[model samples]
Target: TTGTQGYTVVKNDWKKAVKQLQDGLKDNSIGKITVSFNDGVVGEVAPKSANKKADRDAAAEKLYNLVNTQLDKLGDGDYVDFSVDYNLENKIITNQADAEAIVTKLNSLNEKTLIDIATKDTFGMVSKTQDSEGKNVAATKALKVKDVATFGLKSGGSEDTGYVVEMKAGAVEDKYGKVGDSTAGIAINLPSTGLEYAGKGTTIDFNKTLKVDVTGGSTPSAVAVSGFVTKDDTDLAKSGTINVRVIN
Candidate 1:
């Protein structure tokens, strides 16, 4: 049966629920209680504090304190999924041993782990200097990539393109400041290549390369990938930037 039938149990806040239980007990009208956790598990059971038998009432108080203390230590954002089945008839506390295990689970979760990759297209043909026999000559150079790219991490994820990088607690806190997402702008040099001509003013598929170095984990890793650049029917270089994101 529901705890006290009238008293309300605060969702995800065990501190308040325990206070309510104590108030009900002082009034000498509280019965067995069932509190639920965010992990979709029954958290605790507070038996009738006014029971005539010492064994039943004492055991109930002990179990109530044990679970309440653990819940009290939880952070505001921390969530615990634990269950406790107290059989008053048998004076047994079952499924309560796993209470501490939930702490490990909660501590393992990262505040922010998602990462995204974005690029800015600012590449075009340019001129450079070359030496011809003792005289400096101006030469028309092939199309080059000079765009700036960035990486960011958010609280959520995308179904199609997942995170490309992950940050630890220190990095997340430093970049995002406790919550939300952050982006870092980075510029990498790329090799020059002639723009592929497909139609009158259309350029074919031109590849842009990028490399990412991931750190702050068990082992550091470097990833190299190529993104494509396309041109429209107007014959002018479109402001489209190439984006290459890995499912990290």
Candidate 2:
């Protein structure tokens, strides 16, 4: 939730997808998922089960679309882009007992993994408010959580925007066995202060330091760094880390 309002898959393969699995786990730390059988290709959907295929396929597509939409709503530093897939690998529900147990486990793990991501990803950076009791503001209250408001968030109402990414080469060069990309910067639309201040999706430049006046200051404060834009894609999906602090 941002301020007043808050609003809130894929593939196959026996091994190829599992290979991508390691990357997916690292991307959000969902933990490793084990596939029972890996030697041979998982059999394709039988012609008789076309209906089941269509239904599950539709469901995956729906979830895929939802992930993208949520990322867009989260606003800057709150997006994740990567591929993910789930498979049964011949595991069986077998009976009502099995089905119920599976559902319970799925829901429980779902909540836990999401909670982990919330505290571990983009939610950590947002600023929120506390109540009269003086507890830390609710995580949902973070300014960035407000998709519509943050829709226009940027660098001091400038007309420029910055984009962020990792450099593949640099990531490969790192000493740690873990390597991929170093964070890189790009431009995104600067936030708007509205008409009086030249806002409404003002543009910004990348790699250049920007100074903007905060309240009670005669001059602009300096905030310099690489740039990044909020990821926007209704087709994208991500899991993020969240942190909550209590303060008076």
Candidate 3:
């Protein structure tokens, strides 16, 4: 919990949710407990045949409008755009944050340093603790760029693309505003200048030197270099795929 308050998601699984509710019922001081699904139903479960699409849509619309209102308060230039989509089958909602815009903002705040010189594409997100123990904890989410894959033009294939395809370096920012090694979580697979492949199962650290060859080729044949962003050895932070493309 964060400080004195806490928040948690109750899985819809009947056994788990009902068990939680029973626990709350046993606590006399707990007061009124409310439970509902993402479809916007209120306390007291609705019938299986009940239609809650309207409820879900209305609630979702309000959330969307609220986000836009806050964005307006941030002024047009400073706010990052996002889209909210609902999954009816799963009875859930999803938010798609503008990755590029987020990265730009992070760079502006110096919360993150984007090595864009040899970079093609990058994206990241921060994680925050919402609850701890029995109290709500004050916390700021952290961001990290995870799985990254890039394609480089071969040296002597057919086309002189005149551009490089490899990432020179990469890293992630920690809570103390320090950037740490990321190659340990990122695996790079690339072919050398002589067409000899490298990084088949090696962990590449972002703080150290890195290289991906860009060989010339006709039709601009590209080498497939793929890597995943696993959690670093030092922290609990995690990330998704950070896609990259380098072509001439």
Candidate 4:
């Protein structure tokens, strides 16, 4: 039992996603490094009963096919347009020059500094670990937690209609009001996705600033974010987990 309850939810969401990857790799004191998470929707698929309407149209067609398939595999970045091979089955980088130095640090990511995962939506790919770990490498190993809350829910009153009363603007608030969570563990509370207020899934207040998509900017800066979990339809099969840290 040394995993500390399976590294306690991505080691507590990787300490605020490595403190926002040390302020987007400006380095507010980065020590031992090795954080690799890539669930940019990890082959999206969910639905085992959550708030209806085809589960919000399959989570809006899986987030519009994951932002046009990551804008066609990170186009604006141009590694000849996406071409990285960090050796397929890399658990925590077995070795091999740290998987070709993260394939030249994730093929020199650009596209507006690696499009901020729906600019605070979810579905991520944090990185920063070209091989330099001395301890605290609590690994969930091949973690892959995907579906969580499916765009939870949250929309309040502006009341631009007819009647209605207080605590009403579309309804669905019996409880459920947790927020924040990224690093492949997407925890959204209905910010986007046509609102009418049908709240339900809402949950995950694991603190705030849980948005992600940092893929090595400052020569050595890759600590992606995505911390998914709970609600309904994990679809069973041990569904939930995405952590690989090389913390100090």
Top TM-score model: 1
Per-residue accuracy of model 4 over 96-189 as CA lDDT, tens digit each: 3433443333223212221222212332322222114321111122112121112221233121111111111111111111112212222223
RMSD of each: 25.1, 25.6, 25.4, 28.9
Q: On a 0 to 100 scale, what is the lDDT of residue 193 in model 1?
A: 27
lDDT of 3 by residue, 1-248 (tens): 32222223212222343333332222111122233222232333222221333333343333334333333343322322111111112211111122223223323433332222111122112212212332222213432222222223224321111111232223322111111212211222332222211221222243321223223332222222223221223221121111111111
What are the lDDT figures for the candidates, one per model? 0.30, 0.23, 0.25, 0.25
Give candidate 1's error at residue 133 in angstroms: 99
Better of 2 and 4 by lDDT: 4
Give the better candidate number (2 or 4) by TM-score: 2
Residue pairs with colliding backbones in model 1 are: none
* Residue 194 miss distance in model 4 (angstroms): 14
What lDDT score goes with residue 241 in model 2?
22
- Report the Cα lDDT for residue 87, model 4: 13
- Between prediction 1 and prediction 2, which has the larger lDDT? 1
Please name the candidate that would achieve the greatest lDDT relative to the true structure: 1
Q: Which 10 residues in a row give candidate 1 its minimum summed lDDT?
A: 171-180
Residue 88 miss distance in model 1 (angstroms):
21
Q: Could you give candidate 1's per-residue lDDT for residues 1-248 as a string of tens digits?
A: 32311222333555555553443332222334444444444544444334333433454565466556546565454444323222212211112223223223323332322233211222211112223432222213221112222222323322211212212211111110111112222222222222111122233232322222234233212222223233444422232211111110
Model 4 misplacement above 4 A: 1-134, 141-150, 155-212, 217-219, 225-248
Candidate 2 to truth, TM: 0.17
| TM-score of candidate 3 against the unseen true structure | 0.17
